[PDB]
Amino acid sequence: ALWKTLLKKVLKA
C-alpha cells in the first residue's frame, strides 16, 4: 500500500 517505493534501494528511506 505504497511502501515498495520507500525501499526501492534506499533500504527504507
Ligand X SMILES: *C(=O)CCCCCCCCCCCN
> Which residues would be at the binding site for ligand X (CB under 6 A)?
1-3
Which of residues 3 and 12 has its CB atom nearest to ligand X in the complex? Answer: 3
DSSP 8-state code for residue 13? -
Query: Minimum distance from CB of 11 to ligand X (Å)?
Result: 15
Which of residues 2 and 10 has its CB atom nearest to ligand X in the complex? Answer: 2
DSSP 8-state code for residue 10? S
Query: How far apart are the C-alpha atoms of 4 and 10, rounded to whole Å?
Result: 11
Query: Minimum distance from CB of 4 to ligand X (Å)?
Result: 7
Q: How many beta carbons lie within 10 A of that of residue 5, not counting itself?
A: 6
